[PDB]
Structure formats: C-alpha cells, structure tokens
Amino acid sequence: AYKMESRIKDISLAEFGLQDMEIAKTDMMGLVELQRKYRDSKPLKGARITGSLHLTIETSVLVETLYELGAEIRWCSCNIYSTQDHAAAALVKKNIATVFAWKNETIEDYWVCLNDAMTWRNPNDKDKICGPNLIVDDGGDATLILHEGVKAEIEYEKYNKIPEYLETELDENGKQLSMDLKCMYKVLKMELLKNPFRWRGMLKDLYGVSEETTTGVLRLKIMESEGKLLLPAINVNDSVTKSKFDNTYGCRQSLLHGLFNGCIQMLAGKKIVVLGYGEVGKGCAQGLSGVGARVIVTEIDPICALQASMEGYQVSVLEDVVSEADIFITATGNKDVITVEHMRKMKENAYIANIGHFDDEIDVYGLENYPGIKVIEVKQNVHKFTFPDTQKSVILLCKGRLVNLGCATGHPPLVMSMSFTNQVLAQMDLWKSRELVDRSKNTRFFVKKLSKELDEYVARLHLDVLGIKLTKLTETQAKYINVSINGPYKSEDYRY
Amino acid sequence: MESRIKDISLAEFGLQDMEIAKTDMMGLVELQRKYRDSKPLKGARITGSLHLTIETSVLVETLYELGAEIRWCSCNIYSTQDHAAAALVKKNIATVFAWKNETIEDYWVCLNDAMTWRNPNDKDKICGPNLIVDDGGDATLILHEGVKAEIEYEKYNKIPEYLETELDENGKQLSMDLKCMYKVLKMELLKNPFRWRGMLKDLYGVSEETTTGVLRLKIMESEGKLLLPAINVNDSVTKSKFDNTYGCRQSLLHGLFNGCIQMLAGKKIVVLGYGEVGKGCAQGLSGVGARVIVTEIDPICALQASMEGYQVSVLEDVVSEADIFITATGNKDVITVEHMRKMKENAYIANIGHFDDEIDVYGLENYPGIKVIEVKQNVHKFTFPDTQKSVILLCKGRLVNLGCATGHPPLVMSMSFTNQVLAQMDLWKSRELVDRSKNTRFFVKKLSKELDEYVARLHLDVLGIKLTKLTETQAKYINVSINGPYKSEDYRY
Amino acid sequence: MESRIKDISLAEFGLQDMEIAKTDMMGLVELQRKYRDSKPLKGARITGSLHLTIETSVLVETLYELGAEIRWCSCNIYSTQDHAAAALVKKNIATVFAWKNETIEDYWVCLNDAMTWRNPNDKDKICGPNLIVDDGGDATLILHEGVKAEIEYEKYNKIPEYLETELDENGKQLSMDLKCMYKVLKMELLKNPFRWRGMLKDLYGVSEETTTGVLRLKIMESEGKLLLPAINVNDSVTKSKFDNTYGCRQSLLHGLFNGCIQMLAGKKIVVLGYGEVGKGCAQGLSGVGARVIVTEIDPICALQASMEGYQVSVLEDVVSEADIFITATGNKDVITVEHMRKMKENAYIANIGHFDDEIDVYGLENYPGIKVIEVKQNVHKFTFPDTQKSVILLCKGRLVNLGCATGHPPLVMSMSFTNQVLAQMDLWKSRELVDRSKNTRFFVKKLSKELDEYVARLHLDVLGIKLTKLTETQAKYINVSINGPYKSEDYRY
Amino acid sequence: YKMESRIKDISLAEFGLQDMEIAKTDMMGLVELQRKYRDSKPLKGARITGSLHLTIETSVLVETLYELGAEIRWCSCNIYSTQDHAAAALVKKNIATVFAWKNETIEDYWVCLNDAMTWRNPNDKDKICGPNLIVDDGGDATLILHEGVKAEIEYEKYNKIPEYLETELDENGKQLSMDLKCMYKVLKMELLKNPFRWRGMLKDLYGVSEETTTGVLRLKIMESEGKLLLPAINVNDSVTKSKFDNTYGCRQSLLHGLFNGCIQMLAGKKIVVLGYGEVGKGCAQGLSGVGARVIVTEIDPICALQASMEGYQVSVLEDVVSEADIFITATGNKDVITVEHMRKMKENAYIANIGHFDDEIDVYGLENYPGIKVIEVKQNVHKFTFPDTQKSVILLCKGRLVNLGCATGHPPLVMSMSFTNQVLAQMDLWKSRELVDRSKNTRFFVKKLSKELDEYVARLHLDVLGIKLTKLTETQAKYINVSINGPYKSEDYRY
Ligand SMILES: NC(=O)c1ccc[n+]([C@@H]2O[C@H](COP(=O)([O-])OP(=O)(O)OC[C@H]3O[C@@H](n4cnc5c(N)ncnc54)[C@H](O)[C@@H]3O)[C@@H](O)[C@H]2O)c1
Ligand SMILES: Nc1ncnc2c1ncn2CC[C@H](O)C(=O)O
Ligand SMILES: [Cl-]
DSSP states (O other): OHHHHOBOSOGGGHHHHHHHHHHHTTTOHHHHHHHHHHTTTOTTTTOEEEEESOOOHHHHHHHHHHHHTTOEEEEEOSSTTTOOHHHHHHHHHTTSOEEEOOSSOOHHHHHHHHHHHHOEEETTTTTEEEOOSEEEESSSHHHHHHHHHHHHHHHHHHHTSOOHHHHOSBOTTSOBOOHHHHHHHHHHHHHHHHOTTHHHHHHTTOOEEEEOSHHHHHHHHHHHHHTOOOSOEEEOTTSHHHHTTIIIIIHHHHHHHHHHHHOOSOOTTOEEEEEOOSHHHHHHHHHHHHTTOEEEEEOSOHHHHHHHHHTTOEEOOHHHHTTTOSEEEEOSSOSOSBOHHHHHHSOTTEEEEEOSSSGGGBOHHHHHTSTTOEEEEEETTEEEEEOTTTOOEEEEEGGGSBHHHHSSOOSOHHHHHHHHHHHHHHHHHHHHTGGGOOTTTTOOOOEEOOOHHHHHHHHHHHGGGGTOOOOOOOHHHHHHTTOOTTSOOSOTTOOO | OOOBOSOGGGHHHHHHHHHHHTTTOHHHHHHHHHHTTTOTTTTOEEEEESOOOHHHHHHHHHHHHTTOEEEEEOSSSSOOOHHHHHHHHHTTSOEEEOOSSOOHHHHHHHHHHHHOEEOSSOSSOEEOOSEEEESSSHHHHHHHHHHHHHHHHHHTTSOOTTTTOSBOTTSOBOOHHHHHHHHHHHHHHHHOTTHHHHHGGGOOEEEEOSHHHHHHHHHHHHTTOOOSOEEEOTTSHHHHTTIIIIIHHHHHHHHHHHHOOSOOTTOEEEEEOOSHHHHHHHHHHHHTTOEEEEEOSOHHHHHHHHHTTOEEOOHHHHTTTOSEEEEOSSOSOSBOHHHHHTSOTTEEEEEOSSSGGGBOHHHHHTSTTOEEEEEETTEEEEEOTTTOOEEEEEGGGSOHHHHSSOOSOHHHHHHHHHHHHHHHHHHHHTGGGOOTTTTOOOOEEOOOHHHHHHHHHHTTGGGTOOOOOOOHHHHHHTTOOTTSOOSOTTOOO | OOOBOSOGGGHHHHHHHHHHHTTTOHHHHHHHHHHTTTOTTTTOEEEEESOOOHHHHHHHHHHHHTTOEEEEEOSSTTTOOHHHHHHHHHTTSOEEEOOSSOOHHHHHHHHHHHHOEEOSSOTTOEEOOSEEEESSSHHHHHHHHHHHHHHHHHHHTSOOGGGSOSBOTTSOBOOHHHHHHHHHHHHHHHHOTTHHHHHHTTOOEEEEOSHHHHHHHHHHHHTTOOOSOEEEOTTSHHHHTTIIIIIHHHHHHHHHHHHOOSOOTTOEEEEEOOSHHHHHHHHHHHHTTOEEEEEOSOHHHHHHHHHTTOEEOOHHHHTTTOSEEEEOSSOSSSBOHHHHTTSOTTEEEEEOSSSGGGBOHHHHHTSTTOEEEEEETTEEEEEOTTTOOEEEEEGGGSOHHHHSSOOSOHHHHHHHHHHHHHHHHHHHHTGGGOOTTTTOOOOEEOOOHHHHHHHHHHHTGGGTOOOOOOOHHHHHHTTOOTTSOOSOTTOOO | OTTTOBOSOGGGHHHHHHHHHHHTTTOHHHHHHHHHHTTTOTTTTOEEEEESOOOHHHHHHHHHHHHTTOEEEEEOSSSSOOOHHHHHHHHHTTSOEEEOOSSOOHHHHHHHHHHHHOEEOTTOSSOEEOOSEEEESSSHHHHHHHHHHHHHHHHHHTTSOOHHHHSSBOTTSOBOOHHHHHHHHHHHHHHHHOTTHHHHHHTTOOEEEEOSHHHHHHHHHHHHTTOOOSOEEEOTTSHHHHTTIIIIIHHHHHHHHHHHHOOSOOTTOEEEEEOOSHHHHHHHHHHHHTTOEEEEEOSOHHHHHHHHHTTOEEOOHHHHTTTOSEEEEOSSOSOSBOHHHHHHSOTTEEEEEOSSSGGGBOHHHHHTSTTOEEEEEETTEEEEEOTTTOOEEEEEGGGSOHHHHSSOOSOHHHHHHHHHHHHHHHHHHHHTGGGOOSSSOOOOOEEOOOHHHHHHHHHTTGGGGTOOOOOOOHHHHHHTTOOTTSOOSOTTOOO
C-alpha cells in the first residue's frame, strides 16, 4: 500500500535513515516528549494530513510524531533539491507515510508530487477521491495549489471551458511565466478535465493549515486581507521559539555548511554582502563573522539597518559594492534583489547564493537565458556562468534555491525540533477545534498564532538538551513583576 | 611506473576546480609565472607524501611548471580527493599512487612506490628521489627505517626479527601502520638490500609541512640520526599562524558539519590542546555558538584560553557532561577507552591532529562485546555492551577536516605551499654543499623572514589589502629597512 | 468478527421504521446534520450494551455518522428488536451480537464479543473499546470483575475458586447471570489473563443510561474501585424527568396490554416504588381507569403519591386483595414467593425496573411441585399445588415494557440518546486528560445544564412548542442570561 | 363441525382454550348464565348464525349459546378481527361450525358469511335451510338476507339476473365498493343454485340481535321504510353495552391499537378525534390519559359542548388538517377524511378509524390516487407517499376498525357485559318465536331489553371488581319511588 503508492528514489536506503532519525532524536526532545505523552491518547486520531515541507531527517521525526499521535500522512518536499532520500526511504519502509519526494526533482515532477500528496482516497467509501483534513505547509505551495485550483474551477464553470490563463506561457502582460507556474497550471488543467469540482469538494473536510516560514505567512496574510483565505491558518513561523531560533541560529550554522560545500574558497577576509538583515540575515552575518569574513549588509528598513551598524557592519546599497564584493547572499524574501545587470558587474568568480525561501531573489532565468552565456557544472548543484562580451564568470550555488538545503542538509535537529514542536501543537489545535469551523454560515477565515504559554512550553522541553538550569520565582518575586510562577513571563508585545 | 588512482574520468572536474582555486592561490600562480621559463628545478626528481587535494595538485602543477619530474602519494588513507588525483595523471603532471579510502597496507605500498624511481641513465636499475615534500614524516620515516633495516640485515645476515614479530619491545601489539610499513621493508630487503642506502647518494633534502613531522625531524637531529638536510616549513610565520589556526577554523567546522548531524550551538565542546590548531578550532566553534572548554598541559597556553573567556579543565572532570570532544594535541593517548565509557549517550569524538594516536581507536574497536554500525561514509557508532551507551567517532580518529571534509581552503594552502616551493628551490640550489664522502651530520633549518614576508605580500591583492610604505625617517626610527624584514627574529606575531 | 443476529432479511423493515422514527428524534437528526462532516468521534471504538430497539438503531447510526467504529449488544435477553439489529448489520453501521429471546449464556457471550476488538495494527491481537455506552452496568461490570479475576488469578497462580463454584459466599445458589458471566471470565483467563487490564490503557470512559447502572457506578466510586471516567446520563433533567416518567407512562401500558388480557379499569393495581418511573406508571394506569395503590420506603415520595389521590400501603396489607402488581423500585426481594402464595386467583405480576431481582422468579420457578404453562410468548401462569391458586407473570420478571412490548417511543428516547451522544463526545474530546501513570482515582459526573437545556431545545419543534424570549430587563431581574441556563443547579423541575 | 369448518389452523386450539379460561375470570355474566341454564337449555333446538368478530371474548359467547342448547354457525364481521386460536378452540371442541380467519380477502369474507347462513335440513340430508336466530354486528348478516330477498323478487319479475348485480357501478356511474361487488357475486351465484333460498329462510327466522350503533342505524332505516323482515333487538343501546363497551372499551383498546400500529409517542401530539359520541368520548379520555392534546370535530352542538366542558378544543377538520399529528375517526358516518384532506397533512401523519366500517376514510381514493407509492410498514400498517409533494401519510389497517385490526379489541369484562345482553336477547327472541305470524302481518320492529335485565347485567359483574352495593331501606325506597329491587331510574335516564 505505502511502497506501491509512494514515489521515492530508493527504498534500500531506509536503514541509514532510521539510524539518523534515532541519533537526531537525542536533541529533538520536544518531539520525543510529544510522542511519549500522546502516542496512546492519539490527539490527531483520524486526521488525514498532507505535508509540503523539505523532507529531511528532521522532517521524518516530525512525520513520525504526527503518525504516533494518530494521523495518516501523505508528504512531499517544498523544494526540488531539499529531500534527503534516506529520510524519505525511512518513512516509506516503516509505513509511517505515503511519500512523493526525491532529491533533484524536475520542476514538472515537483508539482505532480504536491498534487499527489493532496490526493487522498477514502477506504470507508469506495476509495473516492478526497483531500486532506489538515495541511503542514512551508512556503505556501500546498495552500497555493488549493486556492488556485478553486479559482480555476470557478473560472471553468463561468464560461464552461478551460481557462485561457492556464493554456498560455505568458502572464497578464507578455512576460514568460515562471516554470513553477507553468508546471502548476499544467496540473490544474489536468485536474479540471478529470473533475472540475475536485478542489471545492475538498473544502468541506479541510480544517486548517499550519505554515512554517516567513514567505508562506506573507502569502497567508495577503489572502486574509483580500478575504480569500479558504481555511483556518496558524502562523508557526512567528512563534518566538521558531523565528528567534530557527531563522537565526539555524541559518548561522546551515548557511556555513552550504557555503562550505558549494564554495571552495576561504570565507575569511572576504567581503560578503548579506542582502536583508532580518531574522535570517542576522544569523547569517553572525556565522560569516564567526569565520573571519567582513560582512556588508543591505537593507530597506531603517531599524534593521541601524541594528546591523550596531554590530559593526558596513551598511551599503548593492550598487556601491557590487563590483568589489566577493560573495553575495540574499536573505530578503523579496524578488529581483540581484539582477543580471548586477551580475555582469561582479568581479571574476564572484559567488552568488540565496537562502530565502524562493529562488525569485536572484534573476536565475535572466542569467540562464542571457544571449551567448556559457555554463559549466562545477559540482552537483554548482554552476559557473561566463558572459561572452567580458569573458568574466560568476558562480551560482544551486540555481538560486535555498542554499542551506540545496548545497547542504539544512538546520540541525535541535532548532528543527523547536520549530516542529510548534507544528505538532498547531496541528493538534486545528484538529481539536474542527467542529467550530462552519462553512454554511461564516465562510471568512483568519491567521492566528499559538499562545505564549505554548511558546514557553516549547522552550522548556529543550532545556535539558543543553544542561540549562532554570531559576524559579518566589511568590513575592512573581507578584512584584506581576507574573505567575509558571508564566507567561512576558507581555504579548515582548520582542526577546 | 603506471599511476594507481580510483578513476581517470574525474579529471575534468579536477582541472576545473584547480582553475577556480587558483583565483585565490596567487602565491603559487606567481611562482609559476615568474619561474616557468627558467625552470630552476629542472632535472630534479621529487617524491611527495601530502594529502592529495585540489590545493595540492596546484602545488604539484607548480613544481612541474618549474621543471621537476614528480611522483606523489597522500599522507593519510582518507584525505585524497579522487578528481584532484585524476587531473594530475590526465595531464602527465606526475605519477600518482593515491585514492580515497585506502587500506593501511595499500597506503605503505603507495608511498614505497612513490619513492621508487628508474635510473635516467640506465633502465633496469632503480634509484631514489632528489628531493622530498613530506607531511607528517612518513616518507622520511620509511627512508630512515629502511636504512636502519638494511644495516642490521647485513650485520646478522638474516631478516631482522622485529620485522617478523607483531608485538613491540614491551610485548604489546604493534600499530597496523608499523606492521604494514615493516611488511614493505621486509619485501624490499629480499628484492634489493642496498636500495635505501643507494638513495642517500642523490638525496639533497626534505621539506616538512606539519608540526608532528617537524617533531620527528627534531628527535632525529638531536640523536645525530638525520640522513639528509631538512627545511621546517611548518614554522614559517605564513604557515603556522595561518594554515594551522585560520585553516582549521573553517575546515574543522566543515568536517563536523559533514560528520556530526547535531547543532554545535550551546553544546559543551572540549578542545584538547590550545596550540596553533586548538586556537583556531576554538574560535570557529565559538563562532557558531558552542561553549568551548579547553584542556592543556602548558600553563601559558592555558592562560591564553582563559583570556578568550574559555573554561580550562582536565578531561576527567568534564568527560561525563561534555557533548563533543576534539583532540588537537599532536600527542598520544589523550582519549582512552576508559574516558569513552564515561561519556554521555551519543557523544561525538573527533581528532584534528595529524595522527590517529590521540584517540585509542584500536582499544575501542577491540573492546570485548563492542557493537559497531556505519552511520555514514567514515562515521561510526560504537555501543558498549555493559551500559548500552554509544559514542560516535568521526573517520576512525583520522584528521577530521580531511577525513570528513576537504581540508583547508585554497588561500591558506597557497601560503603554506608557497613556502614548500621556496623550500624545495632552496634545497635544490644548495645540492653541491651536501657532502656524503665524510659522515657530516645534517640539520633542520627554517626559511628566512625576508621570504616569509614575501609569501604574505603575494597574497595581499586577493583580499584587497593596502599596505603602507615607511618613510625613510620612519624606517630609521624603528631600525628596519623600508623593504623589511620588519620584525626581529624572535617576534611572535 | 461477523455479526450474530436472528435474520438479516428483516433489514428493510428496520430501515423503514428508523426513517419514520426520525420524524420525532430531532435531537439525533440535528446531531447528524451538524456533525457528520467534522466527525467529533472519528476513529473512536465504541462498545454498546443497550436494548437494541429501532430507537437504539438511530443512536448507533448517529455515533457512526459522527465517526466512530461500533460493536453492539443488548442489555436484556428479551429487548432486542430483530429488524432493528438487521438494519444495522445490512448497512455496515455496526457489528452486532443480539437477538430477541437469548439464553442467559448467549447474553454474556454476546457482551464479551462486543467488548472484543481486533487490533488494527496486529490483526492477530485483541484490544478493547475506547468508550462504552452502557445501560444497567453489565459492560462496566464484566470489565471490573475481569480485572478483579486476573489479579486474583496471578496472586495464587490458578483459576479463582469463586469462578468454579455454583454457590455464593453463604452457600446459596448463584444467579444464572453470575454463573454465565463467570463462565466467560474463566474462559478468558485461560485464553489471555492480561485481556481486561490490557483494555484499561485505551479506555477513556463510559456513559450510563439508567438509575440502576448509576447506583453501581456510585458504589464503585465510593469504594475507590472505579477504573474509568463515567458520565451519569440518567440524571440529566432531559433524561430522568422524561424517559423514566413519560416513557413508562406509555410503554408500561403497551407491555400490560400485550401480556395481560384483562381490563385495567377498576382493578386495584399496586405500584411498588413511586420514583421517576413509578410516577409515570401510576399516571398511565389511572389514565385508563385503574385504582392505583402505591408502596414506598421514602416518606417524601409517599406523600407525593397521596397528593395525587393514591392510597399508600405496605404490600402485606393489600397482597391478598390487589389484582395486578408492578415493581418499579430498582431494589430486590420486593415480591417474594411468600407474597405470591397469598395473591388472589389469576393475579398478574410484572416488573419495570432494570433487573429481574425485584421479583423472586427463581424461588417461584423452583417451588416444589409448581406447575407452569406458557399462556403466550413470554407470559407464564404458575399454579401452586397446595392451594391450587395461580399467578400470571409477565416475561419472567424482566422489564415488561421491553419484554412484552417495544419500549418507550422515539421522542423520549431521542432526548435520552441525544444526552448519550453528547456524553460520548465529551469523553472522547478529553481523552488526553485521562492518565493511569499517576495512578489516579476516577469519578462520575453529569452533563452541564447548558447542554441539558439544549437537548430540550432540539425537540421543541416536534410538538409545535413556541418558546418565549426574555427581554434584557427581565433577564437581569431574574438574574440569568437571555440564552440560559435559566435555573440554579439544585432546581428540581 | 370439523367436516365443514374453514379456519387457519386447528393446532392453535390449545392456546385458544387456555385464553378462554383466563378471560372467564372476568366474564362472570357469561359464566353465570352457563351455570344457571346448562341443564334447562332454554335455546334447545335453535339454529344460530353469528357474524361477530371471532375473538377469545366471542368464543366465550359462542360457548355460552352452545351450553344453553343451541346449534351454532359463525363468521367474523371484519376481515382482520378474527383471532385464529379462538376460532380453532371452537372447532376442536365442536362448539360451532366456523368460517373465519385473520386477514381474509373481501371475496372470502362474503363466502364465509354466506356459508354461516347455510344450514342442512334437520329432517333431510339433501335440502338446505336458514338459521332460526341471528347474532349480528354491523348488520352484514341482516343485509345479505334482505338483499337476497330483494334479488329473488327482481329475478322473478323479469325472469333474468337483475342487471345491478352484473355491473360494477352504482346509479351515479361511480365504482361500487369491493364489499358490494363481492356480496353481489355471492347473491348472483345463489340465484343460479336456488332462487327461493332467501325467501325460504323467512319461515323459520324468529329474529336478530344487533351489537353496534352502525348495525342499529341500518335496522332503524329498514323499520322506518316498512322493509324489516324479522324481529330485532337493539343490544347496542342497553345501558350496560353503550355506556361501557363503546366508551371504556375503546378507552383501552384504541390505545392498544395505536401502540401496536403507530411507533410514535402520543404525549404532546395534536390528535384529532372526529366524532364525540359514546366511542369518541372514551377515545379522547384514553388519549389524554397518556398526555395527548385532543382536538374534537362534531356536527352535534350538544356533543361539541360536552367536549369543550372536558377541556378539549373543538374545530372543523379543515382548520387543523395541516397541523395535527394523528387523526382518529369515530363517527359511524362516511367521507370524513378525504384524499384532499390527506394531501394537506404534515409528513408522516397517522390516520386510523375506530368506527365499524372503513367508509369514514376514503381508502379507495388513496390507494388509487395516480402515482401513489405504498409500502408495508408492518402487518396491516401502510405508508402512502404522494408524487407531487413527496409527503407521506401512514394508514393503520386500511381504515378498518383499529382496535381489532391492529390489536385484539376490548378486554373481557366489558365484552361480557355486551355479550350477556346478546345471550339475553337471543333467549327473548327464541322464547317469543310463536308470536311471529308469516301469513298475517309482515310488520316487524326493533326493541330493546328492559331496564330490569339491563341492571341485572351490571349486578352480574359487580363482584369482578369488589363493588359493594348499598341496599335501600323500605322508607327510602318509598321516598324516591322505586322498588328495593329496582329498576332504580326512569326510562329516559341517561346515566
Ligand atoms: N423499563 C424502563 O424502560 C426503565 C426506564 C427508566 C428506568 N428504569 C429502571 O427503573 C428502576 C427505577 O428507576 P427510577 O428512576 O424510578 O428510580 P427512583 O430512585 O427514582 O425510584 C425508585 C423508588 O423506589 C423506592 N423503593 C426502593 N425500595 C423499595 C421497596 N422495597 N418498597 C417500596 N419502594 C421502594 C424508592 O424510595 C424510590 O423512590 C431502576 O431499576 C431503573 O434503572 C427502567
Ligand atoms: N586542502 C588541503 N590540502 C592539503 N593539505 C591540507 C589541506 N588542508 C589541511 N591540510 C593539511 C596540511 C597542513 O599544512 C598541516 O600542517 O597539517
Ligand atoms: Cl478529537
């Protein structure tokens, strides 16, 4: 059932995956505790969960936790390069989940895999096609294919034909659509022809989505302000134990791993430009400085720019340092941060990489299609592009995809356990409140966050890993600072 | 002879990494530009025993462009980058005996093969190298032990019984490296017992790369047993204060990130030895949030660690609570099987020193009832049967930055190897001064500060460094020449 | 397992009746409409021991639509309606072990089978239910007596003596229900002596339907021996004040009309017990002209009967003159063999309490030389040899409304069963809060007044009830919320 | 006896005899008559044909007539009211020759009645004759006799089978009821066997005693038109019959009929009782007894006010047809509930009749409505669904008297009171037989039993319920102007 239906690279790699999961668990005490505490009561019993999140060894422990808490699971990765095949094999081999993921997927297969993960069959009702009850999303692709599907079906009924926007290679104003959109549209057209009520049919049983990253939250917020969000949502990224640990300390280590694997050069003494000084950019700069690099920051936000200056970093606009810098790292969550025109001005063998969720930060398409460009594969997922006029080259790590997961194996278990403990709590919250979702009356959905009580709980579960000894307030002390001995200890607007 | 590498087809990826790497190896690039026409090393036979990385192939390419004939092998069983080896053979730069994941027996055969040259006058007769590039002293050791073997072979006119026994002087099992070296020596005594002493007539010197190899040279020098001139490359300022410190700062982290799946942040990481290597390791580990705890025998180095805010303890007081252990002492028996049994569940262990001796890997592997599983390529989890607790060892205790990663980056290696080429050029030009006819003793010397500063000058443009020029009056005030040297001989930088 | 019922071909009749019944079971209809998609009981395994009537079939259907997997049996040998059981099996709504006119032996086997679940992981292993819907407490009893048996079994490493004997502690013959339960318990000790205790880990609660079952839960709670959380459904206002009262007002009459051919008008009919059931019985009997005489032990209840114009006497003073006797006490030995021997020729006897213990049927059946004839299905005339006098007993003293008729009608059962579904949802939603690690003590609780009023709201439309709404000023004056609850916790309605 | 009888199953006999003995504990009037007259046998030699629901209670009536010396033939007066174990008991003991079973077709009903009226000549094997006396309930036995006589006169007048017997329509061109077509089918058949059959029975017919209101109505109509062909006794209007059986009997048996046929709770429901006469009064009382909200319909202003005095709403069917839950007809009239009323009722409304005939409800109109879907809910209970509205109504036992169609009728006590009147009426008719002159006058009347006998029936049942009657002193008897032994009330007293 699980092996037949799953689509993975190689099932024989399962044991390596299982051994790694067990080693990782020494530090993932949040997930370990959740399994110990809830594997019998099963708070997610009966829930069909579709996950779209980089299928790493850390993610396998997340999936395992969901499974032990009673859920059935279908999973895919949210990036073509991030899957670790031995982690994927472990899940399939142990019948923990039906998996559709492998390292180095074509963009076409990426969308087929996501759609496959969203496609369920109900054994209690003639194996009728249905959707998930809950979604674990990272970047919003699962949430996007649902909403774009609903949109495609409404447009389909309106004129009783395939929408024209799904059959063209151009967008609203003559520009070539990204390959990801063309590949998603190809799947949406394929599903309209099979059943044009598919996506709307899924809304009946869908009780929520828990989003992992900043870019996904951005997408959720935009839908919410337009009144187009079709299901409840929990913003996992903005938990303190997520955004202030994963985004920061996780990248501090994983960026370096990615650069070490993709870039052969010494980082020490190099001028490295970190574009964006947010939670991710802060961790990146700290890591880079930690190994002797001279970090130059770019920012649009005056507060973040000043914070960078307070840490001793030069803050410049890209145009003033593009011709002189050695390495460029985008961490903005924005688009067109590094253009082809910027690339043409870079010094010989300047390295370029992105750590934001999507490749849009760098004009990778513009570079690959530059007339007369020459490309060489330096190593797996590292390419050198040479311009014909100047004969100068630039080296791009993993086609602009998040470098820590494209050129390395992402953040280590400890911080992923903090992030994933929030995910499990979010999934439990959405499932346990499923009765309160009413579509025949309200229809308007919102984005929320987990309570500070839970947020603090995530931190408590990981203290023993590092031998942290916490102090306990006396009754008189608690009253003095106006808090309960058991927390929460900070006001809702506290920034840590 | 015919090169022995893993796969010749990897050559293009190797040549391509060499060209990228050269963007930063301006020392070697300059030496090639300046000396490729005059070829100051023309006619020289050079045998090298040094981790065959991409950075090393640029060193080999540089020795080749300067006119030397070359034979090479790696000085560790796991440090060879196969594509780098392939690039060298593909362009006939050198005859190579190297591949990643060699057995100890094959390591010694490769080395022996790299030292074997054929007579440029005759054909059927054998000879040795003129110059040696060594890292750790293994090429130098086999030469000396070979001579020592041939001498005692003639005296008692039979195979010396220490080459046939597996136990040492104290009845304890010899290391696999010694047994495999002794196996090779026995074979050469039967094939030709004048081989090692035959090489002495044409040996003009050795240039040693690392602290541990220099230690071996100094011991042979004090006993009056050194058989050729030697240049200590490790102790150039542009080698010891850059490669050992800043190179490890980045390469230890690379090795740990590849071998150890866990987060270093917040972990109590013990760095055993706070010398040039240890200092760099500590700095890197701190750079990614680790809590570094240092062990030392030298009260000066211990105070230095404390001045950078590090706790300084004895291993026995922290072995049960620490998370990761990193040996950087260049000593032996620093981590014992008894230390390992007291470690917490899934504690990580690794060595960055030149030899595996720092950790008792043999005692671990041969512990009664031990259970071992391969976590990934060159990472093993050992589980003790009495406690059911496990420890994870990176690459069987071999230098972790080259066993689980690709070693230091090109910039610092270019500085280290620029010193190697200059040392080779020095030994070669001074060959007439080596007089064998009268048993004169040989010595260990270092490169001049003039050349040491030169190495630094050649790499300033890589990082956009702008040097200030002294005025004539300023130069006089501090009593130096405008062109250097700028510091007295005992300056520590 | 495969269901064990009388006849699957009766399914269509059952399905039609269920559909007609739903016209009045608007509590269950609404729960299905509102929760069939979200499924608040999804994945829960529910075992039910409750008279399998058409009304119960709609309860089961409701639990199923809300997501549970279900196994069901009846809590009386005569109460199952075969067409109701067939409907459930035909539609795959539940696995059923029930049929009308079961032997006492088959009754305990059916209950035991209903409690047995195939483990979804290891198809070759057994497990128990997560939740239990009980009526009278036999499911709860067999579980607790099972645990007791296994503990006593390991304590002396042999089958406990009390399970292998036909006598009770005082040498008196055990009731057939106990002998048959014990038979099953001995059979399970030999198969798997960890069965019952193994079920506890996944047991989150029991919701109890009737007064007698609640008494049993209350005794276990005070002794500290209750093994799972419990919800007392009987004592919801929308249950005890409707089903027990008005349900019996109609179903007692239906039972009597089917079993007793004689006219009720003018007869002296003794109603033993004037509680919630007796009150309804008395009202129905006098509604068709009978002269009701009440017996009571409670002075308050006795006064209430007197206030409704009924004579209140002790059984002895009227046993020789009364025509019909109806027990509604929930007690035992209310009608003894000696009472029966003093009754007039052709006196009728029936019980409406949960268990047959109210009448000494065993003593009657085993009276020496007693003659018995079957008047009709489940109606027997016993003739004493010494007096030649006869008494006519309805369905061997089993609850007459369900033994000689089809029990209460759908409207009140919907009110009772809507309470059952809410209790099950409550127990399932808070399953994570149950813990057996800390070795905790379990309790009996009741549903809130908010939910109790909601049950009533769900049934107002059935009868065209137009409810008045409080103004904001009125609500403040009587100190309540416009949306209720409207009465304090101790309010008696 | 066992030779001719047509019943379902003789093996049910033991259960029937056993129920008879249990029933007799309360049927003290019948037990007393048997004890007083089994030796003198006042009905000795009388041939009695009965058409009255063959229940256990009726078996006791037949046993009583048999003990009193009569030869008996019996059938039921409804296709669903027979209890098979009761019929079997009579056949096994040779008490009577029986033609009756539960769930007869309408064709079989009339054949059974015709067979119960046919007697073999006591002085000849070959020839056939009629009964001496008739015990009738609803008037069907009486009807077939008169219609038979009418059909014989018509047959001889035009020397051919009367054309109203061959067609299946009435004067208006409307389809005849199935009971009329099947009766005519039998009357046509008998003209071809013996066209003097019915007139030949007159010679020996000494009278009929009628049980129910509807049968009496039929008798009163024949009497007023000068067409009654034999003396008749109105049993329905004895005080110990109409004020007990009709009222208290239905109070219990309507409920038993409803509880068996209708799965729903009666409490709180709006239940319409159409007709508030002796039957309706008892019905309303029983329904209220179990919490129903009774709504009464009436054409009689006196009866309507009576219902209002007991707290019942009085409405016209049209004003409540859309909101009521259950409808019970107790009028003895026709077309009280039409198809159009049925089409307006709420989803799953229940409909039933307790009057003697199904005519009160347009059952034929419902069954033949175009596109109607019908399903059997249980034995004798059907759900009918309309195609345009998709709404349904559930009819109990095709509109036949519900207490006997869906249950087993009144209990023994009141039936004993009704049947003690029947036995007394049979004795009176038989004892006065020589006062019937067929040669002289063909002017027959309907009379009732005297108040003395009426009070006697009540006396015979007082001990069943431990009733203690007070005795008048001589001075008290003179003061209220009655005899110490009754009668105690004037003839017009209404009780
Ligand atoms: N047949 C049904 O459908 C049905 C429905 C509901 C409840 N029940 C059962 O009916 C029984 C009574 O239920 P209830 O809710 O009326 O209980 P209750 O406690 O309200 O009433 C029982 C009454 O019996 C009286 N009593 C006890 N022992 C007596 C004795 N020896 N003599 C006289 N009176 C005595 C008590 O004083 C009490 O008032 C229980 O067994 C219950 O489970 C049956
Ligand atoms: N990249 C490297 N190539 C060759 N040798 C390397 C590299 N990184 C570290 N080493 C080890 C040499 C170093 O100078 C030492 O002394 O051990
Ligand atoms: Cl839940």
